[PDB]
Amino acid sequence: ERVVIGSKPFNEQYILANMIAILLEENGYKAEVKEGLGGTLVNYEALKRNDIQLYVEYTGTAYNVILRKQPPELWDQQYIFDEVKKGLLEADGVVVAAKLGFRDDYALAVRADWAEENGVEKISDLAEFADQLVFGSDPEFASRPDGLPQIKKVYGFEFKEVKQMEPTLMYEAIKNKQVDVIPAYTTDSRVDLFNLKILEDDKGALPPYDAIIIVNGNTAKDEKLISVLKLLEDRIDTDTMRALNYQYDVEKKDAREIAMSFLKEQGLVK
Ligand SMILES: [Cl-]
Ligand SMILES: [Cl-]
Ligand SMILES: [Mg+2]
């Protein structure tokens, strides 16, 4: 029978949902994509009902929004993945078919040239420079307990200055050197456009958002279908996903053609 794939209404989701569909069709299934079906719980409730068979979720989103679990003091990638896999199965029979290989986290970003010059790769590397750096922050992230205050508590430093600004011209602000550090999503195409580097949250101040294919419980008992999905296991790292999003956002390529090119290059299709 047809396999209907859900998606949330943005770039990465359009690309991955079409990717899964193309791979399934190459392997004998008929597939349909519902692009931009809705948000997290629109998709998840659809998945429980079998109105869709699968979609791409993120571990931290499942932990916080689907399962509504109490946040830990420090966030560990593996522990959150484990609690989400166990929690989705226990609650609704939903199966984690595959980790895709990338994270779409809220992270700290700096200019790449500056990071390269100073050997900076992770958030703890900023401590030495923090009293020289300007942080650019929307007001909510600077004030709320699990934003800037959490980073400061976990990492034990403060910046020279905090400039309040809304996200619309924030990449412009870091490019123009108004600020030196901003919060950014790790797969945002603008991180490539504006030549920034994402920093590793090495002490776990912020949640992890590992991309996972999740599947209706009964759909998941089809071992042929599961085997096809596992062909994407660990296939797409964060750098790659960001580059695919760039194709969509900057190069104006369509989601299906982005997805198709990738699978063809990998030898998964043709
Ligand atoms: Cl929703
Ligand atoms: Cl969340
Ligand atoms: Mg790259």
Side-chain angles (χ1 to χ4, degrees), residues 28-251:
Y29 292 84
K30 286 186 225 215
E32 168 179 358
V33 179
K34 300 290 197 162
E35 279 181 10
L37 185 50
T40 290
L41 285 182
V42 170
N43 281 281
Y44 190 72
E45 292 300 329
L47 184 70
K48 286 165 53 177
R49 287 195 304 272
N50 202 50
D51 286 340
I52 65 179
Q53 281 61 78
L54 65 101
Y55 76 104
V56 187
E57 195 41 276
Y58 306 88
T59 54
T61 303
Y63 183 95
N64 287 335
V65 179
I66 301 179
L67 297 171
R68 292 199 349 86
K69 298 198 78 140
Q70 295 281 13
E73 286 312 320
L74 296 175
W75 294 93
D76 180 282
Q77 190 184 8
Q78 168 60 19
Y79 301 159
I80 295 311
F81 175 85
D82 189 53
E83 292 172 49
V84 164
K85 186 168 154 115
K86 294 173 158 45
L88 296 181
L89 180 76
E90 161 206 283
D92 297 298
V94 163
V95 167
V96 175
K99 313 189 73 159
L100 287 174
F102 74 90
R103 282 168 61 176
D104 188 356
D105 301 342
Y106 213 47
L108 294 192
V110 298
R111 292 181 297 279
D113 283 334
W114 178 89
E116 269 148 27
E117 289 151 32
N118 291 281
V120 175
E121 313 174 354
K122 57 202 180 169
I123 298 178
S124 50
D125 300 336
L126 301 183
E128 334 151 54
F129 306 105
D131 76 289
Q132 296 142 271
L133 302 179
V134 174
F135 188 89
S137 187
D138 108 278
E140 305 289 282
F141 188 80
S143 65
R144 88 179 162 171
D146 61 310
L148 189 53
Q150 196 53 19
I151 290 154
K152 291 158 62 183
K153 181 224 135 214
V154 171
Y155 288 99
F157 62 63
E158 56 262 13
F159 293 97
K160 191 192 203 273
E161 302 175 32
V162 180
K163 300 195 172 165
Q164 304 280 67
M165 62 189 48
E166 306 291 341
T168 206
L169 256 29
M170 209 157 72
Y171 280 90
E172 326 280 348
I174 194 173
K175 184 66 175 73
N176 285 197
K177 314 228 180 112
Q178 187 176 15
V179 301
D180 305 311
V181 186
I182 63 172
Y185 290 101
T186 55
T187 60
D188 199 301
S189 57
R190 292 172 289 180
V191 165
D192 282 354
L193 223 216
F194 294 97
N195 188 34
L196 314 184
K197 172 168 195 62
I198 294 305
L199 301 185
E200 180 203 346
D201 171 29
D202 60 297
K203 298 191 188 186
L206 296 164
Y209 293 86
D210 280 278
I212 44 169
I213 302 175
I214 61 170
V215 183
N216 169 275
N218 282 337
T219 303
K221 295 188 168 110
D222 182 346
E223 276 330 277
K224 178 165 161 155
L225 187 156
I226 289 295
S227 298
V228 175
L229 298 177
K230 291 196 178 271
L231 295 171
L232 297 172
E233 182 121 275
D234 200 53
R235 195 162 296 262
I236 305 171
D237 64 21
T238 300
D239 222 303
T240 294
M241 188 69 257
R242 183 166 58 243
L244 298 182
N245 285 338
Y246 184 103
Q247 293 178 40
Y248 188 88
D249 290 343
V250 180
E251 300 180 347

Side-chain angles (χ1 to χ4, degrees), residues 10-39:
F10 53 92
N11 49 36
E12 180 168 292
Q13 287 274 320
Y14 307 144
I15 296 161
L16 295 166
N18 278 287
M19 194 183 289
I20 292 162
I22 293 162
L23 183 67
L24 287 169
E25 300 204 328
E26 184 75 358
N27 288 282
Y29 292 84
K30 286 186 225 215
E32 168 179 358
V33 179
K34 300 290 197 162
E35 279 181 10
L37 185 50

